[PDB]
Amino acid sequence: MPVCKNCHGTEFERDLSNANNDLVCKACGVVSEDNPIVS
Amino acid sequence: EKAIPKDQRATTPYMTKYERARILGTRALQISMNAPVFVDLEGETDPLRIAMKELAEKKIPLVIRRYLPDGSFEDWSVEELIV
Amino acid sequence: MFILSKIADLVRIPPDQFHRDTISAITHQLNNKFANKIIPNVGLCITIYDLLTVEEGQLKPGDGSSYINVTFRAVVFKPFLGEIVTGWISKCTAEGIKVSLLGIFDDIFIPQNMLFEGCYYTPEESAWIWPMDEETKLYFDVNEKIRFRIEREVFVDVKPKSPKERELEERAQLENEIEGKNEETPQNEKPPAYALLGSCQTDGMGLVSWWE
Amino acid sequence: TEGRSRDGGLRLGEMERDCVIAYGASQLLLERLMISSDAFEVDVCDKCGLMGYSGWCTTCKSAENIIKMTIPYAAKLLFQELLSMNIAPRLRLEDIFQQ
Amino acid sequence: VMTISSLEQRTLNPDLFLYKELVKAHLGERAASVIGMLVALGRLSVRELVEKIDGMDVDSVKTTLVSLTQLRCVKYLQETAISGKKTTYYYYNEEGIHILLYSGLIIDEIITQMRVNDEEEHKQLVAEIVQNVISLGSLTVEDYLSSVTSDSMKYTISSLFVQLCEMGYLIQISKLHYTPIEDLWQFLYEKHYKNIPRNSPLSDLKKRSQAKMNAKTDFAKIINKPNELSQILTVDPKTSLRIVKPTVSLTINLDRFMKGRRSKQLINLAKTRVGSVTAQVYKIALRLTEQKSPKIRDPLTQTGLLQDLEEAKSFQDEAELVEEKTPGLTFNAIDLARHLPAELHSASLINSHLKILASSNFPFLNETKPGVYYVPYSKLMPVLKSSVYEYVIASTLGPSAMRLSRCIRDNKLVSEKIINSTALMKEKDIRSTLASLIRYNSVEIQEVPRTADRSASRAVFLFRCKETHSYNFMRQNLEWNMANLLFKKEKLKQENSTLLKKANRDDVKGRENELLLPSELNQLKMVNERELNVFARLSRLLSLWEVFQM
Amino acid sequence: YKGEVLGITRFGLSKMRDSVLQLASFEKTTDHLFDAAFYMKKDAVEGVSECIILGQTMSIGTGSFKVVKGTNISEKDLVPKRCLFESLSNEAALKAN
Amino acid sequence: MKEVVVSETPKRIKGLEFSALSAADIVAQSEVEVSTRDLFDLEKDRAPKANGALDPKMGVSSSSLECATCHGNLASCHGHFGHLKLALPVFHIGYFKATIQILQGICKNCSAILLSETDKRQFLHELRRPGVDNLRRMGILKKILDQCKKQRRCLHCGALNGVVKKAAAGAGSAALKIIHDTFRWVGKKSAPEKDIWVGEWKEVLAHNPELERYVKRCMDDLNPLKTLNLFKQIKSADCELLGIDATVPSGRPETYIWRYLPAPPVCIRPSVMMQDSPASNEDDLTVKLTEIVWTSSLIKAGLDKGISINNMMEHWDYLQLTVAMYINSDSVNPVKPIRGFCQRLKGKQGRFRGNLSGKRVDFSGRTVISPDPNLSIDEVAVPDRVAKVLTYPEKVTRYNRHKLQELIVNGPNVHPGANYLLKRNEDARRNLRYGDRMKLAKNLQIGDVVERHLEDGDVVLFNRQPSLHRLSILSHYAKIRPWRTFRLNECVCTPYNADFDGDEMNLHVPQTEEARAEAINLMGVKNNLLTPKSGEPIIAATQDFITGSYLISHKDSFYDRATLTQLLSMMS
Amino acid sequence: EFPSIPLPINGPITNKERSLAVKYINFGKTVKDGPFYTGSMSLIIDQQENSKSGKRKPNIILDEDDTNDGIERYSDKYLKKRKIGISI
Amino acid sequence: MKVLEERNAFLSDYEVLKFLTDLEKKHLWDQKSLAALKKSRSKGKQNRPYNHPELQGITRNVVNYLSINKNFINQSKMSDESFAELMTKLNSFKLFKAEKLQIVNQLPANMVHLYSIVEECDARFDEKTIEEMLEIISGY
Ligand SMILES: [Mg+2]
Ligand SMILES: [Zn+2]
Ligand SMILES: [Zn+2]
Ligand SMILES: [Zn+2]
Ligand SMILES: [Zn+2]
């Protein structure tokens, strides 16, 4: 969960717009993961 | 396997549209990988469009490797080829 | 580094190097691809000599970079059977004394081959004392030019790295962070392609050829 | 996914991918069924070249003859559900540039 | 898991592993893949080996073939289809691989029983005169004796050759044994069919009976040609009243030693049975009997002419008739007293031999006659095979499985409910031993439908015998046991090669001071005890496999 | 062309080909793979219906020829430079030894 | 100064060697030996840590759960197999007809392939021909697979043979017993086997006088304990005559009987959590593999414990049926079919006909179409409500650096902008609308794959999903207009067969610079003026255009100079 | 694992099980060292009915049977007499 | 990366020292800060050449190693005219090859290295050649 590159241990927010909804960090902006996988 | 010289050339020298479909795509992908161009641009950038422009000026530094079922591979240059 | 051994290679040049000529781009890639790399059965490289009979290089549809296959001669590290080369001492231990060199390689540590003498370790800041009772009782301190007698090429290089031992090592990287005296993992390093013996050390500058 | 509800997905194939075969498009039909869909990293080998996990093949204890090539994930899913019962689909590797 | 469980060699090739696992330890690196490709496919030509294995071109394949030819691990065939190109086609031979199995306990068994030439420390020459013949294949005296500079021992070596070739053991002319047994029958049948066209209108009886009787008598004189010969000829031209000629190449190990070895097995059978003075008499009787006995391998049926017709009963009729006719062997106690044991009712030896020889009957050993003059065996070797199998299955687990197998065989294939009558326990241990026996493929199952529908709930079960498939299963099991044992011993060789070789190089004159540290002394002694243990178990496992061979 | 009038049905298209992927994924995928695995057919992937699965370029259409770039070698990078010790191997390396 | 680097080489997949699992390399790729009462496959509320059915050393398919040797997640762990111990083995239902073939070509006593020695070499000659086909191998093997049925007795053993058949008639997988009717080919001869067969049923006076009265027939079964040890003396001198070559270690018919069950990974089968109700899914194949562990454990306990042989045969026939309806299902049924490794490969929803050949691609959109004449026939009008969600990557190449800097500094809210960006260093996907935008538009290194919005002049794909002919995927250009319905033109309506009756028709975009020119130079609308069935033009115009040009140029439409002036200016 | 016992006991104190395994090791020493001295010429010129192997065997008259040790001793004497550059 | 030949040609001193010098001519002879503190110098000879991954280690860590290895007990140049006669003049008698490799590599001072290189100097070969074939050492 705190896996990131520029910062460490920040909060996260899945996107609401563009039908993209990836789990992204704050204040620099890095997805820090793959695409979302849901069932 | 055999390097057949320029004497035989057992293939019609016309230009298949599939050949130019490959050449324009490969040239546009090379220019998108920061290759230098051989044509004078006009303040625009689209590698497909300047690939067409370099086709119009006939300055593509490539060569065609038309395969045969026996392994002849028959080198054909871009400049010495009828469009 | 006394050879011009010939090796083949497959070279990927980047597409932004097309403005530069081929004989410099292949030279660039083979310099920064074979700088210091010990090839198995070959040895350590330094640089590339020239190019030989390079043909037309193919072009993969998935990447678009030019893939040119070449063949060339290059300077690798293969001495003779009886090479007598000279470095000097920079490190002292108890079992043996490895000799150093001004930057080509480091791990040429010598075993306990006969050598007619040998103490436990260094008592009074003198690594090897050579009494030879009662002739030539001199010794040598650090930075003494030592010529040593090489053995064959002992180039055993193994890659036994399963990922289970990899995550054991990632648990052991936190051992290196803070502790008074850990010393488990940094002393165990893979010896690179050379476990080289010697039979003479000249004991300073007063010995000629004895004890082989 | 399917439809519009979850996120959505618009399939092409079984009569639609054959259209660009009838045109003769090669790299579009390769890209829009491999790269845009799923770029996966199946490791292979030469001697008994089955699949492994990035550092082995687990059917031979070598960890040296491993090529990190590219593949779609649907073929990997096929290989797992295929050799999951009783078959050994081996993948031989030919050179692409020399000879 | 972690490869120490030894499963990568366990549940794989049982039969095509021993025949070329031996030559890993005997021949070497490239004379093994030839057998590994030849047994695995069968019929191969010259170029087919080269296109199969990517080891070498057609140069060094010749070296392996001419190394395995005189060792008779491979037999050839030179024939054409219709046109020409007379190339050599290749089967795989089995008798040379049997020789490479049996060699040491051939040379170490023959001395105490068969060759009674001399015993005053002649072991220094038996190994030199026998192992050099196995490891080379032939025997030419003008080139083999030329290494020996002395001439006084030459007459003794010639007398050893004469008396040892009296009792077989060396095929004299050494021709035609590189030809297949099936190919001989097909070639003789084809030749004896080509001779009669344009005759009376044929039938199955006339054509089949004429061609098969001519093929049988010609194949019989062909197989009986190398058995009895007279090549030891031209007595006393200037000296040497009994000399073997050195021109003809002379091979080794006719299967009369195999006949003698199963004879020793039958002597062990008679020793564990009644008497044992019957053993001490019948050993000397049977070691004199078995020199003229019919052969185990039994040609005229090795070729696939065993069909359920008059040919099948003719084989049993031949095995009953030829065993009485062709040896003869007019043996009595007056014949036994000529070769009489030293101090073995101790006095009055001849009438005691009469009573012991007449008392060894019922069961089928030593079938007698009022005024007997021979001894048959046709229902004694299968009894030996069954008894060895039943005491092996007694060695498997307890006596109860041996009781259960013998009672299933003896009450003639009965169901399960009456087994509790002839038993000790009611239900638990009998199902336990029947489960541990039905894990083996020796006692079968039988299913009958009750409502003409296959259901595993409404069915009654009985147990078939199926002895011959159980003998084949035990044969391949013993073969796999020998192959696994020798493969583990080859691994024990190859993991400790350099410290054995370092002592093998130059420490021979310094074996007393041992020229080494006392740790590797213990290592060499421990691995030597390991090799002694492996060969000591391999001889016993080899004999137990050797019982199951017909 | 195979000799008789073959069909396009599941029995006709089961003939005429070797690519067991397109032999399988047409009308009966149940045991075409099992028929290929029991007899152990070594199928060389070269076509289109078996190259869309593995994800490689097919030999029809655009992919009938592999494009290649000329390397404009002017016969200058072919001759090497001998070191100044190689005439000595003919001078004094075979002198009565 | 070690830094040793091993060279790399691109390798293309050639060939596809199908074989069978040797069941000796199944312990190589093992990673688990489950076999230990896997009915408890959840550790009392949570995911287990033992062998079980689920396994931590098999991967995950969950969000925050940890997994096997690679310590990632479902995205990183490739999956790991697992073997399964067995006693009293079981036939393969997929190789069942091939088992009939390989057992009917081989006899019962010496277990040799029954051919004459000349005929054996003959078919080894005309089977090893360098010119061979799939038709040729089947046409030789099914040609040699009648003499083994036709021949009465064997080659070099004392007994005879017969017919090998499925038991009576079964298609519901109840008659899965292989029979070898030794009789039915004898007639009135060949005494000894017939003599012991008629002498076996005479000795008992207790139960056989009603057994012989009632059943009077056996046709002996060939259960896999008989079969696997009959496929062991299967000597490879003539093993190649029935298809299988003995040149690979996975080349023996012992491996065609289930000695081990490969447990598939937990990355391939889903471990779905609660779906709007607090209950775990407990996937069907996981239930079948734990139920096949439990019956093998019951056999392993009961056989050395000692139980009844009829209950043993019932439970072991249930073992034989559960594997047969676990793989290649819907042959027995004692939504209620279960899915195994045949309904995932069957058709129209499996991994052949809708998940592999036709797969759901990315970067698409589906909207109804309105007509528009005022566009040229190379352009589909892509509205900004679906053009701002549909990107195209552009690697900066020191020529469009100013334009891409403009689209970075402009922002992803308006249409000429860019959503995501990826620099030369290994980041995942750097976003624009969350972090900085001023500082980010200053460096712009060359290795920068930035995805900008679908602007004007970009090549798009466009197709109807019912596509009857080749002229369905026509590479158009882009155009940015309001009113979110699509516009293409009306002259090219004929190949799409559109009717403008609420007819949705989706579009696609290429991704790399190769396939964009591959689309526009090979599938352009200017190139595709012809249907290839006869070579006539198919895209000229449609109904209003023809019927209005007929009114323009009838014979009697004399125009004023002002009218001709306006009408000549109003075309170009 | 292993439940049973197929009774292969080792009686190593017996004379015959010592001598027979010693003859096994001696037979392995004879066969693993390859052929013997010049008595294989009879094996070469057997030639029963064999055109192809009668061409094969005079090619391998000079095969590596017992001349490898003498050539190795000559190479060791030449190396002790003078230096030579070759791989080992 | 496959290998075709193992010893195609073995090298020696000054010619290869000038080869490493000609590869050192990609920058300068010694100047590192005079080109880094001035304006361009042809943009620093086309914007800081190929040295970046590890290339500054090679040829720079051995140009010191080949230069000063005289091994004299105390408290450094080759030329064309001193090696062109060294290749030819020392080719006199029956002599080996690695002997001359170490002669061209290491210069013997008076007799120590000459005794060390020549194995079986007194056992195989006779006198006076230790003395007469040593006075070409003055060619530097
Ligand atoms: Mg409609
Ligand atoms: Zn962040
Ligand atoms: Zn592997
Ligand atoms: Zn994992
Ligand atoms: Zn049979």
Dihedral (Cα; E340, E346, E351, E354), 10-degree rounding: -70
Q: Do G317 and G88 form a contact (C-beta atoms < 8 A)?
A: no
Residues of chain B with Cβ-Cβ distance to F70 below 8 Å are 61-63, 77
Helical axes H15-32 vs E95-107, angle rounded to 10°: 130
Are C28 and C111 members of one domain?
no
Q: What is the DSSP letter of G164?
A: E
User: CA torsion sign, G302 to G305 to G311 to G312?
Assistant: positive
Residues near D42 by Cβ (< 8 Å), separated by ≥ 6?
Answer: D51, D69, D71, D75, D76, D79, G78
Go through chain D and tell me how many residues it has: 99
Residues near I11 by Cβ (< 8 Å), separated by ≥ 6?
Answer: C1, C2, C3, C4, C75, F83, F85
Q: Which residue has the tokens 């004449």?
A: G373
Are C87 and C156 members of one domain?
yes
D3 touching chain G per CB within 8 A: no
Are C208 and C135 members of one domain?
yes
User: CA torsion sign, G552 to G553 to G554 to G560?
Assistant: positive
In sequence order, the β-bridge partners of residue G165 are G179
Nearest to G208 by CA among C179, I140, E412, E2: E412
H-helix or E-strand spanning residue G165? strand G163-166
Residue of C nearest to H88 (CA): C152
Residues of chain C with Cβ-Cβ distance to G446 below 8 Å are 16
Give the separation between CA G12 and CA D92, rounded to whole angstroms. 9
User: Ligand 1 centroid vs G504 CA: distance in angstroms?
Assistant: 8
Dihedral (Cα; E297, E299, E301, E305), 10-degree rounding: 150
End-to-end CA distance of chain D: 44
Distances (CA, A) of I125 to A21, F7, I119: 87, 90, 10
CB atoms within 10 A of CB G321: 19
Residues of chain A with Cβ-Cβ distance to G64 below 8 Å are 1
H47: helix, strand or coil:
coil
User: Ligand 2 centroid vs E312 CA: distance in angstroms?
Assistant: 90
User: CA torsion sign, B16 to B18 to B20 to B22?
Assistant: negative
Q: Which residue has the tokens 């638990």?
A: E428
Q: Which residues of D55-67 are buried (b: 16+ CB within 10 A; e: fewer)?
A: bbbbbbeebeebb
Are C107 and C176 members of one domain?
yes
Residue of B nearest to C55 (CA): B3
G530 touching chain B per CB within 8 A: no
Tokens of E518: 């006392």
Q: Do D31 and D12 form a contact (C-beta atoms < 8 A)?
A: no
What is the residue-wise DSSP string for E293-338?
PPPSS-TTSSSS---TTHHHHHHHHHHHHHHHHSS-----HHHHTT
CB atoms within 10 A of CB F12: 12
Are C40 and C104 members of one domain?
no
Q: Which of B19, B23, B63 sits opposite F70 (nearest CB)?
A: B63
B29 touching chain G per CB within 8 A: yes
CB atoms within 10 A of CB G393: 16
Are C49 and C102 members of one domain?
no
Q: How many CA atoms lie within 13 A of E177 on its CB side?
A: 27
Domain end point (choices C24, C59, C79): C79
Q: Which residue has the tokens 């390989």?
A: G102
Q: Do G19 and D88 form a contact (C-beta atoms < 8 A)?
A: yes
Tokens of G312: 């043993």
Q: Do F68 and C59 form a contact (C-beta atoms < 8 A)?
A: yes
In sequence order, the β-bridge partners of residue E78 are E88
C58 touching chain F per CB within 8 A: yes
In sequence order, the β-bridge partners of residue G394 are G450
Q: How many CA atoms lie within 13 A of A32 on its CB side?
A: 21
User: Ligand 2 centroid vs G427 CA: distance in angstroms?
Assistant: 11
What is the residue-wise DSSP string for E344-393?
---S-HHHHHHHHHHS--SSSSS---TT------SSSHHHHHHHHHHHHH
Q: Do D25 and G519 form a contact (C-beta atoms < 8 A)?
A: yes
Q: Do E282 and E366 form a contact (C-beta atoms < 8 A)?
A: yes
> Rounded to a whole number, what is the distance in Å from the CA of B67 to chain D's nearest CA?
14
Give the separation between CA I14 and CA C2, rounded to whole angstroms. 12
Give the separation between CA G470 and CA D18, rounded to whole angstroms. 8
In sequence order, the β-bridge partners of residue G113 are G106
Nearest to I61 by CA among C104, C2, C100, C34: C104
Which residue positions of A form the known binding site for Zn(2+)? 4, 7, 25, 28
Tokens of I69: 């290895």
Q: Describe chain G by its helix, strand, coil percentages, rounded to 5.
A: 25, 10, 60
What are the structural domain ranges in chain B? 1-83
Q: Do G263 and G38 form a contact (C-beta atoms < 8 A)?
A: no
Are C24 and C44 members of one domain?
yes
Domain count, chain C: 2
Tokens of G189: 């001869």
CB-CB under 8 Å, F45 with G13: yes
CB atoms within 10 A of CB G123: 18
Q: Do F22 and F47 form a contact (C-beta atoms < 8 A)?
A: yes
Q: Do B18 and F61 form a contact (C-beta atoms < 8 A)?
A: yes
Experimentally determined by = cryo-EM
| Residues 88-107, chain I, touching F (beta carbon < 8 A) | 88, 90-97, 100, 104
Nearest to E223 by CA among E193, E195, E181: E181
Are C68 and C85 members of one domain?
no
H58: helix, strand or coil:
coil
CB-CB under 8 Å, G264 with D81: yes
Residues near G296 by Cβ (< 8 Å), separated by ≥ 6?
Answer: G35, G84, G85, G86, G87, G319
F55 touching chain C per CB within 8 A: no
User: CA torsion sign, D1 to D5 to D6 to D9?
Assistant: positive
Q: How many CA atoms lie within 13 A of I36 on its CB side?
A: 7
I64 touching chain C per CB within 8 A: yes
Distances (CA, A) of E315 to D27, E211, E225, E319, G437: 73, 17, 21, 6, 100
Give the separation between CA C76 and CA C9, rounded to whole angstroms. 15
Q: Which residue has the tokens 């006995």?
A: E293
What is the residue-wise DSSP string for C4-66?
--EEEEEEEEPGGGTTS-HHHHHHHHHHTTSSS--BTTTB-EEEE---B----EEE-TTT--E
Pairing of strands G449-453, G391-395: antiparallel
CB atoms within 10 A of CB E454: 20
Give the separation between CA E353 and CA E332, rounded to whole angstroms. 9
I50 touching chain F per CB within 8 A: no
Q: What is the DSSP letter of E242?
A: S
**PDB resolution in Å:** 4.0
Give the separation between CA E164 and CA H53, rounded to whole angstroms. 31
What is the residue-wise DSSP string for G413-462?
SSSSSEEEEE-SS--S-EESSSS-STTTTS---SS-EEEEE--TT-EEEE
**For B1-83, CATH number?**
3.90.940.10
CB-CB under 8 Å, F83 with I12: yes
Q: Do G542 and G494 form a contact (C-beta atoms < 8 A)?
A: yes
Question: What is the number of H-type helices and E-type strands within chain C?
Answer: 2, 8
Domain end point (choices C79, C113, C129): C79
Pairing of strands D67-68, D93-95: unpaired
G96: helix, strand or coil:
helix
Q: Which of G1, G11, G514 to mutate to test the interface with C (most CBs of C within 10 A)?
A: G1
Tokens of G289: 């593999």
Tokens of E200: 């009376």
> Rounded to a whole number, what is the distance in Å from the CA of G119 to chain I's nearest CA?
49
Domain end point (choices C79, C108, C135): C79
Residue C120: Cβ-neighbour burial (10 angstroms; 0-12, 13-18, 19+):
exposed
| Phi-psi label, residue F33: left if phi above 0, alpha if psi -120 to 50, beta otherwise | alpha
CB atoms within 10 A of CB I40: 8
Are C148 and C46 members of one domain?
no
Strands (E), G197-321: none
Q: Do G242 and G113 form a contact (C-beta atoms < 8 A)?
A: yes
CB atoms within 10 A of CB G368: 13
Q: Describe chain D by its helix, strand, coil percentages, rounded to 5.
A: 25, 15, 60
Assign residue C13 the CATH number of its domain.
Answer: 3.30.1490.120
CB atoms within 10 A of CB I45: 13
Q: Do E280 and E310 form a contact (C-beta atoms < 8 A)?
A: no
End-to-end CA distance of chain A: 20
CB atoms within 10 A of CB G278: 7
What range does the domain containing C70 cover?
1-79
What is the residue-wise DSSP string for B23-51?
HHHHHHHHHHTTPPPSS---S---HHHHH
G395 touching chain B per CB within 8 A: yes
